[PDB]
A and B are shown apart, each in its own frame.
Chain A
C-alpha cells in the first residue's frame, strides 16, 4: 500500500509547506527536514514535487494508507513514543511563530495494535508538525486524526521505521 520513486535545499529543521491560491499565498501544512530528507504527511502535498530554495525536491517514498511521505531520500525518522513520557509538538500554525506544546499522549487502540495519540486541536494547516520526545528527536507528525462526537480532535502520532537500516 505504498509507492516508491536542480536539487533543493535540505537544511535540517522544521518547515512550512506553502502554495498559492488564485488569491494569495498561504501555508498548506508543514514537515521536517532530517538528514537531507523532507518528511511530511501524504495528505499535505499528495506526492507533488516541492521547491526548496533554488532547487526542487522529488518524492522518494509515500503511502496513502500510512499517510506518510518523504522527499530526497528514504524515511530517516525512527524514534517512537515509549508510552510513558510526555511529549512536545512543534506547532507550525499558519501565520504564527512556531511554539512548542507539551502533552501526555493518549492511545489509539487498533486491531493491528496501539498507536500514540494526542488530544490537541490546532488550526487547519498544521498537518506535518513534528512531535518530539525529551531528547528533541522526532517521534512522529501531527495531522491525521479523528473528530470526536463531543467536538474533540485527536491526532495520531504518525511515525514510520527507518527505511535505510534493517528491521530485526
Chain B
C-alpha cells in the first residue's frame, strides 16, 4: 500500500469577494539543481 492519499476539498474557481493582499516586488534568484530557489541570483 501507500502512506499518502488524497481527498477532494473544493472546486477550482475564482472568488470575486476574495480578500486582496501581498505585494509584488521583483527579486533576483537562481534555481539550483535541487529544485530550490537561491537569492542574489
Task: State if A and B touch, Cβ cutoff 8 Å.
Answer: yes
Chain A contacts to B: CB under 8 angstroms: 1, 8-9, 11-20, 28, 30-34, 38, 42-43, 45, 48-52, 56-57, 63-67, 86, 88, 90, 92, 98-112, 117-120, 130, 132-136, 138, 144-146, 148, 154, 156
* Inter-chain contact B12/A132, CB cutoff 8 Å: yes
Q: What chain A residues lie within 8 Å of B9 (beta carbons)? A: 13-16, 30, 92, 98
Contact pick for A51, options B6, B12, B21, B35, CB 8 Å: B6
Docked CA distance A105–B24 (Å): 5
Q: Quick one: which of B7-38 are within 8 Å of A by CB? A: 7-15, 18-31, 33-38
Jot down 24 A-B pairs with beta carbons below 8 A, ordered by A.
Answer: A11-B8, A13-B8, A13-B11, A16-B9, A18-B7, A31-B6, A50-B4, A51-B2, A88-B18, A99-B18, A102-B18, A103-B21, A103-B22, A104-B23, A108-B27, A108-B37, A111-B30, A118-B22, A120-B21, A133-B14, A136-B13, A144-B37, A154-B25, A156-B37
* Inter-chain contact A136/B27, CB cutoff 8 Å: no
* Inter-chain contact A63/B35, CB cutoff 8 Å: yes
Inter-chain contact count A-B, CB under 8 Å? 165
Docked CA distance A14–B35 (Å): 24
Q: What chain B residues lie within 8 Å of A134 (beta carbons)? A: 14
* Inter-chain contact B36/A144, CB cutoff 8 Å: yes
Looking at B12, B28, B33, B41, the one whose CB has the most chain A CB atoms below 10 A away is: B12
Docked CA distance A52–B5 (Å): 6
Docked CA distance A18–B3 (Å): 9
Smallest Cβ-Cβ distance to B23: which chain A residue: A119
* Interface contacts beyond A13-B11, A49-B2, A144-B35: sample of 10 additional A-B pairs, CB < 8 Å, sorted by A: A11-B8, A15-B6, A15-B8, A31-B6, A90-B12, A99-B18, A101-B21, A106-B23, A146-B29, A148-B27
